[PDB]
Scaffold this active site. Structure first.
Site, PDB file in Angstrom:
ATOM      1  N   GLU A 109       0.821  -1.215   0.000  1.00 20.52           N
ATOM      2  CA  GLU A 109       0.000   0.000   0.000  1.00 20.52           C
ATOM      3  C   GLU A 109       0.849   1.256   0.000  1.00 20.52           C
ATOM      4  O   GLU A 109       0.763   2.118   0.896  1.00 20.52           O
ATOM      5  CB  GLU A 109      -1.044  -0.027   1.129  1.00 20.52           C
ATOM      6  CG  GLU A 109      -2.092  -1.139   0.835  1.00 20.52           C
ATOM      7  CD  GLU A 109      -3.142  -1.285   1.910  1.00 20.52           C
ATOM      8  OE1 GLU A 109      -2.797  -1.273   3.120  1.00 20.52           O
ATOM      9  OE2 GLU A 109      -4.327  -1.518   1.500  1.00 20.52           O
ATOM     10  N   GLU A 138      -4.288 -10.513  -0.485  1.00 15.78           N
ATOM     11  CA  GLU A 138      -5.258 -10.454   0.617  1.00 15.78           C
ATOM     12  C   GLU A 138      -6.627 -10.762   0.002  1.00 15.78           C
ATOM     13  O   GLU A 138      -6.934 -10.259  -1.089  1.00 15.78           O
ATOM     14  CB  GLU A 138      -5.380  -9.055   1.280  1.00 15.78           C
ATOM     15  CG  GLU A 138      -3.996  -8.578   1.703  1.00 15.78           C
ATOM     16  CD  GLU A 138      -3.949  -7.173   2.287  1.00 15.78           C
ATOM     17  OE1 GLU A 138      -4.996  -6.565   2.678  1.00 15.78           O
ATOM     18  OE2 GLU A 138      -2.821  -6.661   2.401  1.00 15.78           O
TER      19      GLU A 138
END
Ligand SMILES: [K+]
Ligand SMILES: [K+]
Ligand SMILES: [K+]
Ligand SMILES: [K+]
Ligand SMILES: [Mg+2]
EC number: 3.2.1.23
Lengths: 409, 204
Positions: free
Chosen positions: B51, B127
């Site tokens: 991220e 994820e």
């Protein structure tokens, strides 16, 4: 059987146009094109002979080129003294598609330098580029979504004889029902079909008249070099006849004949002689070395059918098998036999979601029922076995979206 | 094994990772990890962090690892999960059949993603199946897809253990606390609890 298409007499000069090929190539945004026309003659060469190729947009001449015979040097023995290639620049061409079938007219004149015409030939020209790039079939740079149908040549009174009124009826009903493409299942069609598809706008898969489905295994003849010559003429004579029609966008090597080495030979032959059109063929598992398009028949949307050797994967899964990059267009899907087309929406939702699912050709346009007459002379629709034919496959000849008389199902 | 680099709260997310000013600090987060851990057989893939958008610093460090250790693929999800800094399409929370066509960084259906024009890499979700509270609805849909598609090679559930902390009430009895329970503000409340197991390892 029989003499079931036209018979004609054609009187040509002895010094004559014997072949001509029209190609159209484009710059990056299609604002410029070159029309290249190769013209061949037979007969006696004379130094006063010329060829002119002219391009017309309706009544206006937009480009022209004139040259004597004698092509470029091609090898150590020289070139073709009996050919010439004209190259015409065309600015901002109106492009052909099934959406807008813009056409020009090319006129090929064999004449003398001082102006006498020997003879002329001509064709309709549609400016379009067909190419596969990055896994997508592109027409004029945009990815096609094939709303296709397979159409056999069938009439319930006249058998396999085709006429203009029935062709036109069929194209009108196809376009009225949001079709943009047709596959010539499974042979070259009557010549008028391609003229109509050029002019009304439908994308055509032109298919060689080669089907060996009842051999065991299916490739027994198409893997046999002794059958390469007969197969070769079914492919090569189709390309020589139909290569100037803009509606033809894809060549097919035939149908349900397994995958044999004769397929790979003829795939390469077409790729050599006509680089302007992809080649497809479904036999031998739909993704063989003889096809530029994964083109299965009756692969389902989500459900795999893992048959030995020739599996029909879910079309979504097929696209992403390890190493696979080609576009997928079903050569046959949605078998419209009797009360059918259940599940049709599931195909269309997948075709819209996945860029490389570029549609397919429904099987098929029209029921192959034939008219018989009862004791009172009243007509009725007959199918397999109804003529005393045996063995037969009964109602499997009726798979159409329309009844034989073109009434819709 | 994943470098300790996450710049999620930057606007845009790659503001630091595209800045050559920050290339030195990011480089040591990647290089000192590979120097420490490269003899472990259990490490099979390196990741460039999490991220932090997609910046040129990621492409530099992707190629540094490819050069020094050809034995393990490199992945990184930032900047749309399929950038030039990843050997594996590694989206977070891409759905099985449903596309989420966000501008710049869409999350395609994983089945669709594999076959986008020109794409050939494996896909393993970094994820998926966010196990917050009463969740894992739709888990079986991923597994059916992973088994049907060769290149859908699975994923990492988010995540193993709730990040709850123990606090004690006025009677001295323990209780599980989450964001904001320490007077921390702003906080993101119960989003710290996303595990397949409670913090004491009792299964959900
Ligand atoms: K599509
Ligand atoms: K049939
Ligand atoms: K798999
Ligand atoms: K969280
Ligand atoms: Mg003239």
């Amino acid at each position: 059987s029989g003499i079931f298409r036209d018979v004609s007499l054609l009187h040509k000069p002895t010094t004559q146009i014997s072949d001509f090929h029209v190609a159209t190539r484009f710059n990056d945004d299609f604002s410029r094109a070159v029309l290249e026309a190769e013209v061949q003659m037979c007969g006696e060469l004379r130094d006063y002979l010329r060829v002119t190729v002219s391009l017309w947009q309706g009544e206006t001449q937009v480009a022209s080129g004139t040259a004597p015979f004698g092509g470029e040097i091609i090898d150590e023995r020289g070139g073709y003294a009996d050919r010439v290639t004209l190259r015409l620049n065309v600015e901002n061409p109106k492009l052909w598609s099934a959406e807008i079938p813009n056409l020009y007219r090319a006129v090929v004149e064999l004449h003398t330098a001082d102006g006498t015409l020997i003879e002329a030939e001509a064709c309709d020209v549609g400016f379009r580029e067909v190419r596969i790039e990055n896994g997508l079939l592109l027409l004029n740079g945009k990815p096609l979504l094939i709303r296709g149908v397979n159409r056999h040549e069938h009439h319930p009174l006249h058998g396999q004889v085709m006429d203009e009124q029935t062709m036109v009826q069929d194209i009108l009903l196809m376009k009225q029902n949001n079709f943009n493409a047709v596959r010539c299942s499974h042979y070259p069609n009557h010549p008028l079909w391609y003229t109509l598809c050029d002019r009304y706008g439908l994308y055509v898969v032109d298919e060689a008249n080669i089907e060996t489905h009842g051999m065991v295994p299916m490739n027994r003849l198409t893997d046999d070099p002794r059958w390469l010559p007969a197969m070769s003429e079914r492919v090569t004579r189709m390309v020589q006849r139909d290569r100037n029609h803009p509606s033809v966008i894809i060549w097919s090597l035939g149908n349900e004949s397994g995958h044999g080495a004769n397929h790979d030979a003829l795939y390469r032959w077409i790729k050599s002689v006509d680089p302007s059109r992809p080649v497809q063929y479904e036999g031998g598992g739909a993704d063989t070395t003889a096809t530029d398009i994964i083109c299965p028949m009756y692969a389902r949307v989500d459900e795999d059918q893992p048959f030995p050797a020739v599996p029909k994967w879910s079309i979504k899964k097929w696209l992403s098998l390890p190493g696979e990059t080609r576009p997928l267009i079903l050569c046959e899907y949605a078998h419209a036999m009797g009360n059918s087309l259940g599940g049709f929406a599931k195909y269309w939702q997948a075709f819209r979601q996945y860029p490389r699912l570029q549609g397919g050709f429904v099987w098929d346009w029209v029921d192959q029922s034939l008219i018989k007459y009862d004791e009172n002379g009243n007509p009725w629709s007959a199918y397999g076995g109804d003529f005393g034919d045996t063995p037969n496959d009964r109602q499997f000849c009726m798979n159409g979206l329309v009844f034989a008389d073109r009434t819709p199902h």
